Amino acid sequence: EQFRIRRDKRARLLAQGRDPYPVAVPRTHTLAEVRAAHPDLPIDTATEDIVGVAGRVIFARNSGKLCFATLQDGDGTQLQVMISLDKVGQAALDAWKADVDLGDIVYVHGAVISSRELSVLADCWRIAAKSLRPLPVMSEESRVRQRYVDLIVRPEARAVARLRIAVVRAIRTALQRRGFLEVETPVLQTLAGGAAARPFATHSNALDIDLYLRIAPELFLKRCIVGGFDKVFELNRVFRNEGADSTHSPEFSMLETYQTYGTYDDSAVVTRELIQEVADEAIGTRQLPLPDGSVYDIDGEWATIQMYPSLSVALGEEITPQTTVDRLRGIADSLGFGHGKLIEELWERTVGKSLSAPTFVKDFPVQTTPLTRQHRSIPGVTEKWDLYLRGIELATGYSELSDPVVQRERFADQARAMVLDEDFLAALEYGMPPCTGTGMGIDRLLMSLTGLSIRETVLFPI
Amino acid sequence: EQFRIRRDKRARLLAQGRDPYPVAVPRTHTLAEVRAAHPDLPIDTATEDIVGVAGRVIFARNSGKLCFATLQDGDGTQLQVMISLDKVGQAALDAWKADVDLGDIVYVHGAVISSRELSVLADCWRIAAKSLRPLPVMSEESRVRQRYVDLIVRPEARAVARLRIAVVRAIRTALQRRGFLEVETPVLQTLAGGAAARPFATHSNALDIDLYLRIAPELFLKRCIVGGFDKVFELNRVFRNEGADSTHSPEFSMLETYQTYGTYDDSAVVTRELIQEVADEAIGTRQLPLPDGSVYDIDGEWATIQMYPSLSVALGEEITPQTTVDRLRGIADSLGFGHGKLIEELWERTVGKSLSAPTFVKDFPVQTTPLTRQHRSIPGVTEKWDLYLRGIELATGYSELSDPVVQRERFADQARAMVLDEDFLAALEYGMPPCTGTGMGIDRLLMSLTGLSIRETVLFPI
Numbered sequence: 001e002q003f004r005i006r007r008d009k010r011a012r013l014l015a016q017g018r019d020p021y022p023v024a025v026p027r028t029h030t031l032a033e034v035r036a037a038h039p040d041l042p043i044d045t046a047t048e049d050i051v052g053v054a055g056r057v058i059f060a061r062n063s064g065k066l067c068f069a070t071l072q073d074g075d076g077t078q079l080q081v082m083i084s085l086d087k088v089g090q091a092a093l094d095a096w097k098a099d100v101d102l103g104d105i106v107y108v109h110g111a112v113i114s115s116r117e118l119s120v121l122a123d124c125w126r127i128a129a130k131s132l133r134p135l136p137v138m139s140e141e142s143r144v145r146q147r148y149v150d151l152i153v154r155p156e157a158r159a160v161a162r163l164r165i166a167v168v169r170a171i172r173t174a175l176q177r178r179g180f181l182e183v184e185t186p187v188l189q190t191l192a193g194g195a196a197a198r199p200f201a202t203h204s205n206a207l208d209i210d211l212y213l214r215i216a217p218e219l220f221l222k223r224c225i226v227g228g229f230d231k232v233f234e235l236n237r238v239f240r241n242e243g244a245d246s247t248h249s250p251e252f253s254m255l256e257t258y259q260t261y262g263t264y265d266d267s268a269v270v271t272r273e274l275i276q277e278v279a280d281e282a283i284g285t286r287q288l289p290l291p292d293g294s295v296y297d298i299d300g301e302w303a304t305i306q307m308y309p310s311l312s313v314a315l316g317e318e319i320t321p322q323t324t325v326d327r328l329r330g331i332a333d334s335l336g337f338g339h340g341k342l343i344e345e346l347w348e349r350t351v352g353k354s355l356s357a358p359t360f361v362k363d364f365p366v367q368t369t370p371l372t373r374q375h376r377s378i379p380g381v382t383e384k385w386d387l388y389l390r391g392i393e394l395a396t397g398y399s400e401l402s403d404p405v406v407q408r409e410r411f412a413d414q415a416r417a418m419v420l421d422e423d424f425l426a427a428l429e430y431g432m433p434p435c436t437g438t439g440m441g442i443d444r445l446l447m448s449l450t451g452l453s454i455r456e457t458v459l460f461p462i
Numbered sequence: 463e464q465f466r467i468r469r470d471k472r473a474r475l476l477a478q479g480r481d482p483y484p485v486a487v488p489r490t491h492t493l494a495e496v497r498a499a500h501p502d503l504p505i506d507t508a509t510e511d512i513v514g515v516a517g518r519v520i521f522a523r524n525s526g527k528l529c530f531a532t533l534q535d536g537d538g539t540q541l542q543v544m545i546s547l548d549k550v551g552q553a554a555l556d557a558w559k560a561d562v563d564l565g566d567i568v569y570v571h572g573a574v575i576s577s578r579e580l581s582v583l584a585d586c587w588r589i590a591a592k593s594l595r596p597l598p599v600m601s602e603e604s605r606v607r608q609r610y611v612d613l614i615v616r617p618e619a620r621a622v623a624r625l626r627i628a629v630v631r632a633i634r635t636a637l638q639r640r641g642f643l644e645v646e647t648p649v650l651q652t653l654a655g656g657a658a659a660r661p662f663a664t665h666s667n668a669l670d671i672d673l674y675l676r677i678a679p680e681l682f683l684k685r686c687i688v689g690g691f692d693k694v695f696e697l698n699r700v701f702r703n704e705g706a707d708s709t710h711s712p713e714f715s716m717l718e719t720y721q722t723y724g725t726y727d728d729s730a731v732v733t734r735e736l737i738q739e740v741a742d743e744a745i746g747t748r749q750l751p752l753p754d755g756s757v758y759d760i761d762g763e764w765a766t767i768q769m770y771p772s773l774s775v776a777l778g779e780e781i782t783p784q785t786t787v788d789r790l791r792g793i794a795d796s797l798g799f800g801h802g803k804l805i806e807e808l809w810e811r812t813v814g815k816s817l818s819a820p821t822f823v824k825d826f827p828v829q830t831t832p833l834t835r836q837h838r839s840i841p842g843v844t845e846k847w848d849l850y851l852r853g854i855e856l857a858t859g860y861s862e863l864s865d866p867v868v869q870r871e872r873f874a875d876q877a878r879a880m881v882l883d884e885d886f887l888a889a890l891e892y893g894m895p896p897c898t899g900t901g902m903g904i905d906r907l908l909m910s911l912t913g914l915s916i917r918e919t920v921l922f923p924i
């Protein structure tokens with residue numbers, strides 16, 4: 001109902017030649033600037049620094065000759081204003097009382113004082129924007145459908161938003177320091193490769209064909225390696241047309257990273273440093289406070305284990321690349337399609353879930369890692385690692401497969417379970433230097449670091 | 463045919479227990495590093511700095527006991543190697559001759575010398591990747607279908623790639639210095655607004671509905687302003703499902719920028735500074751050399767003109783918001799749907815095309831600018847500017863419309879030519895502070911700056 005009373009104040013403001021949505025108000029300072037400016041003012045004293053401030057009125061308290069309000073700047077910083085009859089008022093004071101509702105953006109020019117709390121006493125004031133909706137005084141799913149309100153009302157929403165931003169910047173900063181070049185590769189592709197997922201498809205009017213939103217940048221990033229990029233990354237959305245859960249969303253921001261003349265051993269080190277550097281820059285500790293109340297320590301060195309041996313220890317018997325699917329099925333049964341899949345699942349069900357401290361698992365089944373080079377010495381496994389951090393499957397790195405003939409096979413096997421990515425394969429046949437790539441999810445990153453859900457870490461999900 | 467001879471060398475290398483795609487080669491330096499290290503070496507003298515280098519063999523010259531090759535590192539830097547019988551050879555020399563074709567990535571450990579040109583004489587050497595395709599010794603449309611080869615063979619492809627990267631970084635650096643925060647807003651939207659374009663649509667399996675790839679981030683970026691972001695930008699792809707031409711592609715990278723408590727006058731200034739700063743960082747001059755052979759000067763201050771007056775001067779009569787479509791049709795006819803459209807078209811046909819120096823045109827027809835605030839004083843126009851740089855329609859800035867009721871109208875008018883963006887409108891009714899937004903295309907930016915076509919400025923178009 002207050003919807004309608006607010007709409008009428010708009011109408012009657014227009015009519016009176018007051019401007020409720022003016023083009024310009026001469027804001028001299030953010031409220032934060034005024035605070036940092038007057039840190040320790042003798043309380044109940046005036047100073048002749050005149051400012052023009054603007055802010056959301058989130059608290060009113062009217063009292064005849066004198067009205068107080070809390071201006072909250074968009075970052076959360078607060079300044080109190082005092083609308084007084086004696087300063088420049090009467091009609092001003094009336095208009096204040098009549099015109100100014102909660103959630104209204106307001107500008108006030110005046111002197112900076114402290115009251116019997118840091119305030120601005122007003123010479124001038126003006127509405128900067130009239131709200132036709134009061135703030136609520138929130139369920140998780142209304143906070144997310146209306147992030148703009150969440151951000152106005154809930155400090156933590158403000159902090160998380162800025163945290164993601166700072167994390168993302170930390171990442172770019174870390175990679176740039178190391179000489180990585182950030183490239184833009186295509187989102188719309190004639191066929192979407194680089195990972196295991198069902199694509200989003202869209203019809204192009206230009207070309208009268210379907211195109212596919214990228215599931216991952218790998219294959220184009222690999223083209224950049226062919227083309228002589230020494231060190232490239234890309235930090236941007238990918239689209240996997242599948243179901244949503246606590247670690248999975250159909251649209252999400254992902255980092256991929258490619259470095260010539262290093263292996264999975266090298267990118268493991270960088271990934272660790274990168275994450276640690278992000279924590280330091282964006283969180284300021286490696287002793288990560290959780291909503292739990294607990295503390296997760298990501299400092300120091302991180303353990304590396306091998307999938308097959310670690311699984312072997314867990315299961316009480318030697319599991320190798322040679323172990324049959326009939327054997328693995330049986331073990332699987334005893335607990336409650338193919339070899340590679342069974343190993344990963346058994347590993348995930350036994351070793352995976354038990355990991356607390358940050359851990360790399362390396363040396364993966366060849367069948368489930370089409371894009372990663374075969375191990376330099378161990379038969380039947382690929383040089384891939386996964387990083388688990390706080391129990392979250394965070395990141396992966398590969399010693400990348402550059403052999404076009406092997407690579408054509410790996411894809412043929414895939415397809416039989418038949419048009420391949422011929423251009424990708426062509427690029428490889430021009431020669432790709434030995435190189436190691438990583439992938440890492442930003443939401444999972446933030447999750448692993450903070451305890452926040454995926455639906456808190458993106459500004460505008462659905 | 464050489465396709466097949468190369469494939470056989472792979473096969474016979476495998477067979478002999480040589481590794482043609484090894485996991486790791488111990489590369490100590492980039493060729494650029496070795497160059498910077500030995501800038502002025504007395505030519506035809508040896509030095510006992512041992513290095514391990516790796517590079518693409520792009521030139522061979524075999525001669526009995528001694529073979530020379532050019533290693534080109536991926537950035538374009540060149541080092542010559544000398545494969546000699548006397549160093550560590552005979553069988554080595556034979557294998558070199560037999561095993562190493564052009565476009566092969568090769569590693570060589572050895573001493574750094576200058577010959578009778580900076581070279582490495584080899585103790586050791588190894589194939590790092592075997593190419594199953596020779597380099598061509600290129601049409602514009604094969605360069606772009608195979609950028610990876612373009613990048614190997616054509617220096618200018620290398621330079622342009624790195625230029626775009628440096629421009630994009632320059633942009634982020636410039637905006638960050640000014641306190642802008644880069645946000646990620648959704649690419650997949652329930653309805654795609656913020657501009658005039660037909661969307662790409664994609665079916666979601668998760669939600670069993672169509673989604674729309676964003677045509678622009680504005681409406682979500684505006685939500686961020688509501689939510690208290692003072693200064694936000696987003697630099698990322700947008701998708702407009704329309705035809706391709708020399709200034710238009712269906713997928714392209716675009717910058718949008720939002721700043722609270724400034725107007726179009728303010729963002730005009732920033733846009734100018736931003737562009738000038740980009741030129742300085744990424745190109746190193748504001749006297750822009752063109753393929754033409756000419757020089758385009760983007761230094762100093764840029765002229766601002768008004769659409770209606772400038773058109774009036776061009777046409778020899780007063781054109782105002784009040785001029786009828788019947789009048790404009792007639793004028794249009796005399797040269798060779800609605801008022802706003804006719805003004806822009808007439809303006810573009812008369813004043814637009816005649817502009818050489820960098821120029822802002824401001825004060826636009828209300829009918830064609832649904833999202834921009836009405837002018838503070840001039841009836842019938844909005845506070846929008848377009849920037850033309852080197853004749854290219856580069857950028858725009860608005861004093862943003864924050865009035866939810868006016869905004870609902872503007873959208874209603876649009877739709878009648880009927881479901882609106884209710885959530886966007888809801889956000890506005892929570893109150894958006896006065897603010898100015900800009901948009902700018904990266905490809906157009908690069909084009910305006912360099913003379914390069916849109917099909918050179920993106921790494922992987924199609």
Ligand SMILES: COc1nc(N)nc2c1C(=O)N([C@@H]1CCCCC[C@@H]1O)C2
Nearest residue numbers: 247248249252394395396439440441444
């Ligand atoms: C929300 O994040 C994700 N959403 C989806 N749908 N899928 C994935 C993620 C996500 O974070 N992923 C990681 C990306 C590479 C790093 C290794 C672990 C995962 O594959 C996969």
Ligand SMILES: COc1nc(N)nc2c1C(=O)N([C@@H]1CCCCC[C@@H]1O)C2
Nearest residue numbers: 709710711714856857858901902903906
């Ligand atoms: C290649 O760049 C573009 N491709 C398409 N399809 N459409 C546009 C571009 C492109 O650069 N645009 C600008 C974006 C905002 C700045 C004002 C001028 C244009 O609208 C529009």
Ligand SMILES: N[C@@H](CCCC[NH3+])C(=O)O
Nearest residue numbers: 194195216218437438439
């Ligand atoms: N494309 C991978 C990430 C890169 C892995 C290293 N080449 C994924 O989506 O899983």
Ligand SMILES: N[C@@H](CCCC[NH3+])C(=O)O
Nearest residue numbers: 656657678680899900901
């Ligand atoms: N969305 C605009 C760019 C931002 C204009 C300022 N609000 C466009 O695509 O034209």
